[PDB]
Amino acid sequence: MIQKVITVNGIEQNLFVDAEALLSDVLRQQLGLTGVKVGCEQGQCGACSVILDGKVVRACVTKMKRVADGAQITTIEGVGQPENLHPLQKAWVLHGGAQCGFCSPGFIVSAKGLLDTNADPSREDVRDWFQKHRNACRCTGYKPLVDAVMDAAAVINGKKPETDLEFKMPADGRIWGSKYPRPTAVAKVTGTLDYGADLGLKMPAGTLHLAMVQAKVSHANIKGIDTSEALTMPGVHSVITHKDVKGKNRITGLITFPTNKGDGWDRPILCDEKVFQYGDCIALVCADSEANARAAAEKVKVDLEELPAYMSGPAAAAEDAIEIHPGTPNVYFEQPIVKGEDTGPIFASADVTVEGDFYVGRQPHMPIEPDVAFAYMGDDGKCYIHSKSIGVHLHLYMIAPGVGLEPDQLVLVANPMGGTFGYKFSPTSEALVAVAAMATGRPVHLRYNYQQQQQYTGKRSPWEMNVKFAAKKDGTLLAMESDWLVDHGPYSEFGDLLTLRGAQFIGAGYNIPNIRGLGRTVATNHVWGSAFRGYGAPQSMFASECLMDMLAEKLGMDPLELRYKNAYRPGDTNPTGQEPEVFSLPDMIDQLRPKYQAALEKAQKESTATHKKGVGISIGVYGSGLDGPDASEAWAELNADGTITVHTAWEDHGQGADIGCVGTAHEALRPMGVAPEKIKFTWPNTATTPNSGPSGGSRQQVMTGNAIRVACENLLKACEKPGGGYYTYDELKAADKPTKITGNWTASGATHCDAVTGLGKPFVVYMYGVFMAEVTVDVATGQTTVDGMTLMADLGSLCNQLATDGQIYGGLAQGIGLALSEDFEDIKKHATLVGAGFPFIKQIPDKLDIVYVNHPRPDGPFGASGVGELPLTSPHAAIINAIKSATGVRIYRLPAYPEKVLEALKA
Numbered sequence: 057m058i059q060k061v062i063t064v065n066g067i068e069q070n071l072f073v074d075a076e077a078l079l080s081d082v083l084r085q086q087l088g089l090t091g092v093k094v095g096c097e098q099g100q101c102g103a104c105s106v107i108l109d110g111k112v113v114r115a116c117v118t119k120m121k122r123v124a125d126g127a128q129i130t131t132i133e134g135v136g137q138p139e140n141l142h143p144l145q146k147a148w149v150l151h152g153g154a155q156c157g158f159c160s161p162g163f164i165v166s167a168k169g170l171l172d173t174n175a176d177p178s179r180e181d182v183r184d185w186f187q188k189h190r191n192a193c194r195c196t197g198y199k200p201l202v203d204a205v206m207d208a209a210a211v212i213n214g215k216k217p218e219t220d221l222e223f224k225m226p227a228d229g230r231i232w233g234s235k236y237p238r239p240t241a242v243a244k245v246t247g248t249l250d251y252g253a254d255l256g257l258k259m260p261a262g263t264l265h266l267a268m269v270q271a272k273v274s275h276a277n278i279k280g281i282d283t284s285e286a287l288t289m290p291g292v293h294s295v296i297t298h299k300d301v302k303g304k305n306r307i308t309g310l311i312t313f314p315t316n317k318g319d320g321w322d323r324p325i326l327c328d329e330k331v332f333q334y335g336d337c338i339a340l341v342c343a344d345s346e347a348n349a350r351a352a353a354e355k356v357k358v359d360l361e362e363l364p365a366y367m368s369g370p371a372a373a374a375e376d377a378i379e380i381h382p383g384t385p386n387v388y389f390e391q392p393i394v395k396g397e398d399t400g401p402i403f404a405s406a407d408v409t410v411e412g413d414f415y416v417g418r419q420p421h422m423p424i425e426p427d428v429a430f431a432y433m434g435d436d437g438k439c440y441i442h443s444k445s446i447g448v449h450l451h452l453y454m455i456a457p458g459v460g461l462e463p464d465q466l467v468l469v470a471n472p473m474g475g476t477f478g479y480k481f482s483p484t485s486e487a488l489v490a491v492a493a494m495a496t497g498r499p500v501h502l503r504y505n506y507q508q509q510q511q512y513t514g515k516r517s518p519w520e521m522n523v524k525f526a527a528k529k530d531g532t533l534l535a536m537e538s539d540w541l542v543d544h545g546p547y548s549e550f551g552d553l554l555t556l557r558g559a560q561f562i563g564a565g566y567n568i569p570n571i572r573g574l575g576r577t578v579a580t581n582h583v584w585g586s587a588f589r590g591y592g593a594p595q596s597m598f599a600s601e602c603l604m605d606m607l608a609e610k611l612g613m614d615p616l617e618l619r620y621k622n623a624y625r626p627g628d629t630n631p632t633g634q635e636p637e638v639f640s641l642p643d644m645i646d647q648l649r650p651k652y653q654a655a656l657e658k659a660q661k662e663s664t665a666t667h668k669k670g671v672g673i674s675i676g677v678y679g680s681g682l683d684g685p686d687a688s689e690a691w692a693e694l695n696a697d698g699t700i701t702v703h704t705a706w707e708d709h710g711q712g713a714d715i716g717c718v719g720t721a722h723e724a725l726r727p728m729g730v731a732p733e734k735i736k737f738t739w740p741n742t743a744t745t746p747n748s749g750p751s752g753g754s755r756q757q758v759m760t761g762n763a764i765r766v767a768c769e770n771l772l773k774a775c776e777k778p779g780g781g782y783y784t785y786d787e788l789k790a791a792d793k794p795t796k797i798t799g800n801w802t803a804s805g806a807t808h809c810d811a812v813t814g815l816g817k818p819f820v821v822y823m824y825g826v827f828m829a830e831v832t833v834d835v836a837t838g839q840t841t842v843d844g845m846t847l848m849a850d851l852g853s854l855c856n857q858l859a860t861d862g863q864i865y866g867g868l869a870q871g872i873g874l875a876l877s878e879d880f881e882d883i884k885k886h887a888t889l890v891g892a893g894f895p896f897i898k899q900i901p902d903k904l905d906i907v908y909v910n911h912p913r914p915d916g917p918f919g920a921s922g923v924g925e926l927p928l929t930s931p932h933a934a935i936i937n938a939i940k941s942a943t944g945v946r947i948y949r950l951p952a953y954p955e956k957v958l959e960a961l962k963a
């Protein structure tokens with residue numbers, strides 16, 4: 057041990073440390089500076105950026121021996137605090153740079169390091185700096201972060217007043233449609249929002265820290281578990297196995313389709329008889345710290361009989377393949393799509409037909425924050441789980457039978473969280489922590505490291521797809537045929553539903569009167585499928601939007617004009633036979649056309665012998681809602697102090713559940729003149745908030761937005777004075793009148809898609825868009841650079857522009873990763889951010905352009921649709937279409953790795 061007297065955030069610290077300790081651990085654990093965020097723990101994400109003697113370093117890879125006596129350290133806490141914000145923090149709030157906020161302290165500290173060395177940076181300088189310092193963001197697409205640094209620099213340089221970094225009310229008084237900052241932004245930019253790992257550090261002594269004993273093979277029969285050595289190890293309390301589970305020890309898929317060949321109870325909580333994928337949790341070590349638990353977990357011995365593993369859909373789906381779940385065939389679900397007339401004869405007599413085989417893979421969500429949760433037994437005897445769940449009520453019912461509790465005896469709460477992008481539509485650690493809290497009776501906390509986040513949370517499910525179009529010479533689509541195989545890994549939850557998305561979205565955007573297709577779901581031993589933003593559309597529309605360009609090529613027609621010819625217009629129906637609710641695609645295409653023409657001409661002009669430029673188009677469509685007559689509930693409450701609490705379980709991945717609530721409520725409450733700062737939101741809690749439903753299917757703005765609207769409308773009526781005006785709280789209480797008022801809303805017109813035909817009206821609101829990608833391909837290396845992305849977006853009406861701009865930029869960036877670099881195929885190699893192709897800032901163009909072409913939705917609140925998943929529906933198709941435009945080669949199987957592109961170029 058050594059004494060180190062240094063200065064941290066301007067204050068002398070008399071530090072006592074191990075020379076080998078990591079600065080991140082010292083700052084967080086010894087000094088309580090939890091504003092230093094830790095994600096990857098491998099120097100790759102920049103979340104733990106601190107300033108050490110004028111240099112920006114990653115604290116997670118900086119040992120204390122590198123900190124000199126008398127060193128100066130600055131963390132986010134030293135940059136600024138609430139009510140003492142630095143211009144960088146004010147700028148972040150104003151520009152909406154804090155979505156999940158997990159990367160915000162690191163970016164801001166890093167940015168301070170930049171401005172202290174280069175006071176007047178170009179945008180390019182800012183981007184170079186964040187690239188060098190590895191500052192990673194998965195939510196924002198980086199553009200808002202650069203915007204914030206530039207605005208801050210102008211103020212610091214005296215070129216602009218600081219008051220200009222503060223939001224100015226539109227004087228309208230209207231915050232709906234505005235750039236009003238989100239309520240949580242100040243906490244996020246000051247590092248004073250506690251995420252799950254921060255909470256763990258602030259839990260009492262006596263809290264047990266958990267480590268997972270995980271399978272190190274993909275498939276096995278388990279013969280036994282020996283915990284003997286683990287029990288003798290430092291700090292170890294106990295080891296938990298399936299024997300300690302008080303219920304079924306299975307998670308239920310809950311809404312498993314009746315035509316599913318499996319019962320939906322396939323997923324264990326702790327493995328008992330079998331390992332189904334690499335990483336499966338077999339036991340939990342409980343110890344006095346994460347470190348001691350992890351050390352002891354290494355010594356737990358599992359005796360198993362390894363079985364041959366099926367590591368792809370085609371492999372598991374072979375007629376001969378052995379059943380992974382004995383008694384259920386590996387191909388456990390099929391969804392037909394049968395619209396209009398038989399397609400065979402139509403293909404035979406059509407002027408032109410095209411066909412392609414396409415693949416989209418096992419995309420990893422890669423939030424900067426790895427999975428974390430905790431549980432305890434309340435004094436009330438209930439078991440409480442606090443996690444990254446984005447569907448607290450959904451997960452309660454998925455896990456309660458498995459853990460052995462009635463619904464009344466379990467409470468799920470959503471912690472502030474550093475992004476999910478859908479992986480948290482699935483339970484991950486909730487049943488694990490519940491089992492441990494129940495068994496020990498103690499508080500328990502479980503933090504996944506980044507390798508566990510990669511290997512042992514769900515993934516976008518790979519689809520092998522064959523799609524065909526028949527059309528007339530003039531481009532009019534006549535028929536489509538489709539076949540898709542969905543590799544869902546071993547656990548069935550929502551696999552059948554994901555397969556149904558193929559019937560709804562392959563070929564979406566166009567009038568296609570005649571469709572014959574079949575989707576199949578197959579269990580494998582690769583990572584289990586959990587929703588990934590777009591959920592079936594990124595696969596489906598990659599195929600159909602690539603195939604549209606192939607059809608255009610074969611016709612000798614411009615690909616934008618072929619889309620224009622076929623795009624939804626009144627009288628048309630979508631693939632499930634339903635009439636679209638608005639018709640915005642022709643409008644969007646017409647508005648994009650000259651920008652597209654200009655982009656083509658720039659590409660031809662700027663292409664060289666070695667660097668070929670191209671332009672690519674695609675359309676995106678997706679539902680806002682869960683299938684059928686989805687519903688939500690909210691309570692609007694007038695409080696004693698004149699503030700109003702809008703109670704919902706709108707789960708915040710980081711997308712903006714707080715601002716969605718506040719902006720929708722503000723608009724609804726306008727008759728009563730309620731200032732936005734007086735409107736409070738509620739963190740999701742199954743005990744004390746209504747069942748608003750999960751934050752999945754880009755549904756909350758529509759479903760919960762409408763419920764909030766209804767609740768606020770009803771509160772207005774509850775407050776109305778006879779004669780005009782409104783009662784105050786004190787008046788209503790003195791009159792013994794209610795002050796907490798319920799609102800409910802249901803998507804009444806929606807119906808579930810039929811199990812035989814796939815036809816139905818699954819959503820009453822959809823999101824529509826048109827993408828344009830501009831790219832440069834180095835033909836010597838096969839490397840593609842995306843130089844610009846454009847999204848024409850119809851969101852009906854914007855609740856908040858900071859929220860919607862950021863959503864689109866974030867989805868576009870994920871689209872660049874899906875197109876060019878991302879996968880989870882190799883269990884080890886893809887278990888790091890850099891290994892799995894995470895897009896760092898230079899991979900995302902500074903030019904991310906949005907054009908809103910909003911057609912108010914009949915059923916959306918104030919006409920709004922959702923936005924969440926729109927920007928990831930097909931941007932990767934536009935990019936691949938742009939590569940084809942540039943070079944003449946088509947990549948059918950994502951991602952377009954340089955070597956793959958070179959092989960295609962040289963073929």
Ligand code: FES
Nearest residue numbers: 095099101102116
């Ligand atoms: S770089 Fe330190 S946590 Fe990622």
Ligand code: FES
Nearest residue numbers: 156159193194195
């Ligand atoms: S706001 Fe950057 S990772 Fe979420």
Ligand SMILES: [Cl-]
Nearest residue numbers: 516588591592
């Ligand atoms: Cl998906």
Ligand SMILES: [Cl-]
Nearest residue numbers: 946947948949
């Ligand atoms: Cl390919």
Ligand SMILES: [Cl-]
Nearest residue numbers: 953954955956
């Ligand atoms: Cl490569």
Ligand SMILES: [Mg+2]
Nearest residue numbers: 140141142143
């Ligand atoms: Mg100041």
Ligand SMILES: [Mg+2]
Nearest residue numbers: 567625627628
């Ligand atoms: Mg027609």
Ligand SMILES: [Mg+2]
Nearest residue numbers: 955956958959
């Ligand atoms: Mg090769």
